Amino acid sequence: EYPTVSEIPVGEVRLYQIADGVWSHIATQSFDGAVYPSNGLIVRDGDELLLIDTAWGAKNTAALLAEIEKQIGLPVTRAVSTHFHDDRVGGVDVLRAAGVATYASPSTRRLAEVEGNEIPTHSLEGLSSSGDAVRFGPVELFYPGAAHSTDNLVVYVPSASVLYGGCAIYELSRTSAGNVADADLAEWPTSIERIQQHYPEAQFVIPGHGLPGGLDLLKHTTNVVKAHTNR
């Protein structure tokens, strides 16, 4: 039932329930002359919701908020962006206008400002060194080291054993690298090793784009990154 790129018109947002109190959000966007899906996460936080990542653009993110109200009916009170690119922060202004408290690490906020992307309001402390983890409501935020970007965070939901990798983890159907312009290709395998060592109990793994899977997505991503490094 997990929605794919061909089953989501650009501008629409679909939700998928992964576990009790954990959903992914799926949207699509035109980029480089193709259409790509993108995932984020929604995690129940008592009687509120924590959002992980925008829906890749202002229009998509407004649709995301509407779909959350229609399907779930709890308020989104906080959001975390897992790196500085537009598929993670594009729509932060919509969230802020809607009363959501937006968060990112200091490194993400700075990179967003340099790039000209939207800047989350609040800073997340305790994530400046590889291997750092902090609890943030019902999730753990982990900085594995540089990978897809130098600032990329991953998110673990302890109660549901859900690991959200963002753009640092590839879906299985992606067998060649994605956007690596800002990547640290040399460190990416080591950063994945840190994720594996820190979250070996994860049951569901959600990539930044495409279908969820298990922990096999981690080794798959290393294989693809290494192949790109050698090409």
What positions carry a catalytic annotation? 83, 85, 87, 148, 179
Q: Are the beta carbons of 212 and 162 closer than 8 angstroms?
A: no
Residue 173 binds Mg ion (CB under 5 A): no
**β-bridge partners, 81:** none
Separation between Cα atoms, residue 16 and residue 25, nearest integer Å:
6
Residue from 45, 86, 151, 171 binding Na ion (CB under 5 A): 86
Site mask, Mg ion, residues 48-87, x = CB under 5 A?
----------------------------------------
> Candidates 64-72, 84-92, 145-153, 200-208 — which segment interacts with Na ion by CB under 5 A?
84-92
Q: Are the beta carbons of 166 and 147 closer than 8 angstroms?
A: no
Classify residue 16 by its DSSP letter. E
- List contacts with ligand QZH (CB under 6 A): 31-32, 36, 85-87, 148, 167, 178-179, 208-209
Q: How far is the CB of 208 from ligand QZH (least distance, A)?
A: 5
Q: Are the beta carbons of 103 and 120 closer than 8 angstroms?
A: yes
Q: Are the beta carbons of 78 and 96 closer than 8 angstroms?
A: no
Binding residues, by number, are: 12, 47, 83, 85, 87, 122, 138, 148, 167, 171, 209, 220
